[PDB]
Amino acid sequence: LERDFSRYNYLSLDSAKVNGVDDAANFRTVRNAMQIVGFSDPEAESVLEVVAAVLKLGNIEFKPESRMNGLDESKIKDKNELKEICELTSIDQVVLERAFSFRTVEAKQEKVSTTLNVAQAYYARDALAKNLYSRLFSWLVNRINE
Amino acid sequence: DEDETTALVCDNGSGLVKAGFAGDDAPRAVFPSIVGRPRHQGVMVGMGQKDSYVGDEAQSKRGILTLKYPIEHGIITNWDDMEKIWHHTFYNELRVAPEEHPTLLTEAPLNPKANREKMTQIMFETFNVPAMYVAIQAVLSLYASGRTTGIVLDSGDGVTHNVPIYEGYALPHAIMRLDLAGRDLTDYLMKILTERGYSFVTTAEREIVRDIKEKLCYVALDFENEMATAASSSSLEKSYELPDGQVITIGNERFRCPETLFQPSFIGMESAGIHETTYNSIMKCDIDIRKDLYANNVMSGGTTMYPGIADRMQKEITALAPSTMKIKIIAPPERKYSVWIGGSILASLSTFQQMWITKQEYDEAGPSIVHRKCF
Amino acid sequence: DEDETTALVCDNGSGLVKAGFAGDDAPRAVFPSIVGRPRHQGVMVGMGQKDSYVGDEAQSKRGILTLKYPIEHGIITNWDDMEKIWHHTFYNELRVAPEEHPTLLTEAPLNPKANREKMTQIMFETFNVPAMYVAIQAVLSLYASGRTTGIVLDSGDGVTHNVPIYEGYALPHAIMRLDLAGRDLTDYLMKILTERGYSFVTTAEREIVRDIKEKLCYVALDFENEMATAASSSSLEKSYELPDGQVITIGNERFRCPETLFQPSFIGMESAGIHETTYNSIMKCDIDIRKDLYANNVMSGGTTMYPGIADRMQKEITALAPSTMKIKIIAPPERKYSVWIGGSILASLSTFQQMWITKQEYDEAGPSIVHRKCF
Amino acid sequence: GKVLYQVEGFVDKNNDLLYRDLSQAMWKAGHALIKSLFPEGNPAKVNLKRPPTAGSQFKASVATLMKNLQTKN
Numbered sequence: 001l002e003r004d005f006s007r008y009n010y011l012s013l014d015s016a017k018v019n020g021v022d023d024a025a026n027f028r029t030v031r032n033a034m035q036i037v038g039f040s041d042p043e044a045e046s047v048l049e050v051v052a053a054v055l056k057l058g059n060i061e062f063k064p065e066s067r068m069n070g071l072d073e074s075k076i077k078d079k080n081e082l083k084e085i086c087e088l089t090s091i092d093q094v095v096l097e098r099a100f101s102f103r104t105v106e107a108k109q110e111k112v113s114t115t116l117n118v119a120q121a122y123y124a125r126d127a128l129a130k131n132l133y134s135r136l137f138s139w140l141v142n143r144i145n146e
Numbered sequence: 147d148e149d150e151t152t153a154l155v156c157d158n159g160s161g162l163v164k165a166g167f168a169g170d171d172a173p174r175a176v177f178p179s180i181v182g183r184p185r186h187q188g189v190m191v192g193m194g195q196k197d198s199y200v201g202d203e204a205q206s207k208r209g210i211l212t213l214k215y216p217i218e219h220g221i222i223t224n225w226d227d228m229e230k231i232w233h234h235t236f237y238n239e240l241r242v243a244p245e246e247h248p249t250l251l252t253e254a255p256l257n258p259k260a261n262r263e264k265m266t267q268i269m270f271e272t273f274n275v276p277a278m279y280v281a282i283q284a285v286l287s288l289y290a291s292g293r294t295t296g297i298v299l300d301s302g303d304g305v306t307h308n309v310p311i312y313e314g315y316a317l318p319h320a321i322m323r324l325d326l327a328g329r330d331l332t333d334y335l336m337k338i339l340t341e342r343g344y345s346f347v348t349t350a351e352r353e354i355v356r357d358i359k360e361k362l363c364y365v366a367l368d369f370e371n372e373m374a375t376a377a378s379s380s381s382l383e384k385s386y387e388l389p390d391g392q393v394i395t396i397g398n399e400r401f402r403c404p405e406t407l408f409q410p411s412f413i414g415m416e417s418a419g420i421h422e423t424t425y426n427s428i429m430k431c432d433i434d435i436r437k438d439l440y441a442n443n444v445m446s447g448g449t450t451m452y453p454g455i456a457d458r459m460q461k462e463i464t465a466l467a468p469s470t471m472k473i474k475i476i477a478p479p480e481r482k483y484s485v486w487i488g489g490s491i492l493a494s495l496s497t498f499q500q501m502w503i504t505k506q507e508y509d510e511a512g513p514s515i516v517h518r519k520c521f
Numbered sequence: 522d523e524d525e526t527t528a529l530v531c532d533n534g535s536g537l538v539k540a541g542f543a544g545d546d547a548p549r550a551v552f553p554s555i556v557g558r559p560r561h562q563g564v565m566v567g568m569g570q571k572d573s574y575v576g577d578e579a580q581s582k583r584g585i586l587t588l589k590y591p592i593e594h595g596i597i598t599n600w601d602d603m604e605k606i607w608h609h610t611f612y613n614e615l616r617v618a619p620e621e622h623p624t625l626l627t628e629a630p631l632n633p634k635a636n637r638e639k640m641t642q643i644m645f646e647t648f649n650v651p652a653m654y655v656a657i658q659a660v661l662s663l664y665a666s667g668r669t670t671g672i673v674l675d676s677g678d679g680v681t682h683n684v685p686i687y688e689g690y691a692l693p694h695a696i697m698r699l700d701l702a703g704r705d706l707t708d709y710l711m712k713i714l715t716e717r718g719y720s721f722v723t724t725a726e727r728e729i730v731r732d733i734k735e736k737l738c739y740v741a742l743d744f745e746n747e748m749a750t751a752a753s754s755s756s757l758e759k760s761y762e763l764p765d766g767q768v769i770t771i772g773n774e775r776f777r778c779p780e781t782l783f784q785p786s787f788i789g790m791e792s793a794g795i796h797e798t799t800y801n802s803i804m805k806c807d808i809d810i811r812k813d814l815y816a817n818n819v820m821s822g823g824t825t826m827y828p829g830i831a832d833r834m835q836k837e838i839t840a841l842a843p844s845t846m847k848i849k850i851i852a853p854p855e856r857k858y859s860v861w862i863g864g865s866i867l868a869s870l871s872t873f874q875q876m877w878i879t880k881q882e883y884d885e886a887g888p889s890i891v892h893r894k895c896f
Numbered sequence: 897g898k899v900l901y902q903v904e905g906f907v908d909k910n911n912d913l914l915y916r917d918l919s920q921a922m923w924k925a926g927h928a929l930i931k932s933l934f935p936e937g938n939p940a941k942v943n944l945k946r947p948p949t950a951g952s953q954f955k956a957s958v959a960t961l962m963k964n965l966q967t968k969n
């Protein structure tokens with residue numbers, strides 16, 4: 001993770017500071033709060049890897065290509081961010097790289113990979129981020145309720 | 147059964163029944179539309195032999211059956227056999243009650259009237275569906291295409307047809323129907339395999355030739371250059387192991403089989419070909435539509451899963467179309483199911499739910515109700 | 522909306538609605554006066570198809586519409602369609618409330634009485650404008666001309682008309698009205714393009730021929746010299762790329778299309794022509810006016826945007842007028858909007874503000890109030 | 897009262913398109929937490945119908961809450 005708030009797609013410089021509230025003290029308040037409610041010490045770091053992933057997905061952007069003729073392929077402009085997330089989440093890079101631009105239509109016994117355009121690549125990226133953070137949040141609620 | 151009462155989409159086009167629920171990206175049941183009946187005596191007592199085997203089971207037991215497609219060229223010809231196909235579709239493959247699910251049947255454009263009327267009669271009277279809707283198949287291919295503007299061909303097993311649509315409006319005076327499709331290419335491949343020396347005449351052997359067509363055939367770009375290329379050497383000659391026996395070795399038949407789809411004089415059918423019925427279907431539209439058709443030429447159905455049919459298609463249409471036009475052949479890898487997939491998208495629309503043909507109004511009006519409410 | 526309550530000027534002449542606020546040098550809304558209605562079935566469900574498309578949107582979607590001009594020869598013929606044109610004018614293009622802005626409508630001289638009466642009825646009763654004023658269009662062209670003395674012709678899409686004015690005083694006994702304008706030249710260009718070999722008969726193709734007329738036609742000075750020049754070689758022959766297709770190549774039709782405006786026997790209309798109705802409109806005035814008319818012959822409206830119509834006009838009138846007269850054809854490049862622009866200048870006058878026809882006196886007198894207070 | 901809704905961005909913020917290969921792709925993770933988050937990601941069972949759109953998800957959540965509040969006082 002970088003540390004400047006202009007360096008992230010989901011954030012900006014214009015929202016970095018509530019005038020009277022600092023984020024570090026509340027951060028230590030949370031990590032002190034997780035010890036009472038049963039969250040273990042590698043467990044909270046394992047959750048912060050997921051929150052790190054949700055922050056880092058937004059820096060992936062897409063461009064169109066000429067082959068094939070239709071439907072038109074999208075590709076990643078630069079895969080530094082893909083390499084950092086795929087090393088971070090312990091996923092092979094061909095799996096997620098193929099998982100941005102294509103989708104398998106799987107019939108009764110037969111499956112095929114088809115192209116998504118640029119806009120639907122942004123919707124699959126946005127939906128992957130907020131669905132990942134959402135199911136993380138619901139899992140935290142289940143872990144508290146355990 | 148199903149947890150919901152979500153509507154069914156049953157694409158039963160001409161040679162491969164594929165069906166499922168609405169909202170799915172792929173059909174849950176894909177099986178060939180065959181009815182096999184035994185032609186030999188049952189000599190083993192108490193085995194459990196049936197009267198007729200349907201679909202995939204008839205494809206397995208095909209060595210002792212005769213295989214009858216109940217639907218040919220998009221027209222249902224054996225209504226009791228097609229009743230077995232639908233009964234196997236809802237009750238065996240999907241395992242669902244049709245009385246709780248609306249069904250979305252597909253037909254081809256320019257079909258007989260008694261096809262859709264009697265299909266409506268069997269859907270409401272025999273299976274007792276709550277609502278049905280018969281829709282033109284290439285329109286559904288344009289739903290899964292993600293476009294409201296484009297000319298579509300699907301090329302099923304019995305019928306290929308161009309439907310040009312501009313801004314959501316059908317152009318029914320420019321719909322082309324050509325009765326040349328994959329079953330005719332299977333029969334022509336049986337003829338030219340008989341030319342090489344392999345005699346397939348049995349309906350099971352016809353399915354073997356269909357598997358040769360699906361696995362080894364491809365569309366040439368220049369038929370005389372690939373023809374002289376195969377005449378030059380053994381570069382493109384590919385071998386196929388037959389079911390339960392020897393290995394055949396086929397050469398130019400790989401591209402002479404689907405070239406009939408571009409040159410219908412091979413099977414003796416006087417027509418213009420798939421590229422020229424596409425171009426004539428474009429030219430029978432209004433003029434200020436035409437470039438939007440050329441930029442959205444959709445080739446998104448069945449038989450057109452050959453390798454190199456999009457390059458041949460863009461070559462022939464680009465040769466026919468005037469210059470400074472952008473000809474774009476939309477040929478996704480979602481083909482062979484996109485007519486179903488757009489069936490799922492059409493059934494999943496909210497404003498579509500008034501366009502179902504229900505009971506009570508079928509029961510008011512009779513089987514002509516589709517000619518009121520279907521296109 | 523608008524920051525002020527500045528009066529609107531809505532020039533809706535016969536074929537091109539152009540409108541805006543007073544005090545502007547150019548109208549903020551220019552769109553063709555068409556209403557397109559779909560003639561084909563809507564086959565895509567839930568797209569967002571409308572009942573009728575108005576103006577520029579109907580010009581875009583014209584491939585699947587039929588186009589109906591609600592006003593022909595300066596006379597409104599479809600009042601519900603013209604209500605759609607005005608509703609689109611105030612609410613869609615200008616995006617303003619007509620209850621807060623006075624409106625300045627334009628008509629042609631020698632019009633039907635129920636035109637201005639029912640136009641007044643729709644302005645006050647349907648749209649609820651606070652004040653309106655219907656004015657003769659060529660008088661407004663003389664406002665933007667910067668003169669109080671001159672004879673004016675505008676030549677819209679449906680009507681050309683000469684209004685001679687001397688020292689601010691109208692000469693209404695010498696007003697000429699000729700119902701020969703750009704839509705008739707479009708139809709005659711459709712006929713002679715059919716003569717060459719290009720068959721345009723569709724209303725969308727009629728708009729294509731209108732675009733050919735606007736882009737490639739010009740007025741010859743000597744029709745037989747340019748006619749024999751085009752008969753000599755391919756010097757003046759110019760090509761036009763059609764919308765969504767091939768390239769046409771037109772020759773003498775470039776100058777046979779607007780020569781109908783000088784020789785109305787081409788379209789079979791028995792009249793004197795635009796130069797001879799201008800000259801007869803001069804000669805029907807008093808004698809000591811006439812030279813001031815010749816020095817201020819104003820040609821400042823619509824159809825007369827052809828290349829070389831001012832030279833042909835000065836040639837024909839100078840041939841008709843006696844010698845030692847200074848014939849000056851005032852033809853600015855501010856044409857096709859100057860009838861609107863003088864609408865803005867007339868609406869921006871201080872002493873004009875008592876001449877508006879308001880409520881309360883329309884509400885006292887009824888729709889004949891224009892025949893009290895308009896010319 | 898008459899609440900004014902700005903229509904800028906409704907379609908971009910209703911789209912919840914997450915499909916099969918994303919849940920499979922994160923199911924094949926070496927991180928056991930992310931694999932624990934996505935039980936739908938196994939290719940050894942079919943991935944059924946997708947819970948798109950997000951408005952139907954929120955309608956489903958409010959419907960769940962109203963099935964919660966009805967059996968209570």
Ligand SMILES: Nc1ncnc2c1ncn2[C@@H]1O[C@H](COP(=O)(O)OP(=O)(O)O)[C@@H](O)[C@H]1O
Pocket residue numbers: 157158159160161162163164300301302303328329356359360361447448449450451452482
């Ligand atoms: N991979 C393939 N390549 C060539 N031909 C194929 C291929 N798959 C299917 N076909 C042919 O297309 C036919 C099925 O077409 P389809 O569009 O599924 O028709 P239906 O309308 O009945 O759904 C098959 O029966 C077969 O002849």
Ligand SMILES: Nc1ncnc2c1ncn2[C@@H]1O[C@H](COP(=O)(O)OP(=O)(O)O)[C@@H](O)[C@H]1O
Pocket residue numbers: 532533534535536537538539676677678679703704707731734735736822823824825826827857
């Ligand atoms: N550049 C041009 N050359 C020739 N004719 C034109 C040109 N521009 C417009 N026209 C013709 O003039 C008509 C526009 O006239 P206009 O005065 O705008 O009509 P209105 O009286 O409705 O304002 C169009 O219908 C078109 O046929």
Ligand SMILES: [Mg+2]
Pocket residue numbers: 157158159160252283302485486
């Ligand atoms: Mg089908």
Ligand SMILES: [Mg+2]
Pocket residue numbers: 532534535658675677822823860
């Ligand atoms: Mg005008």
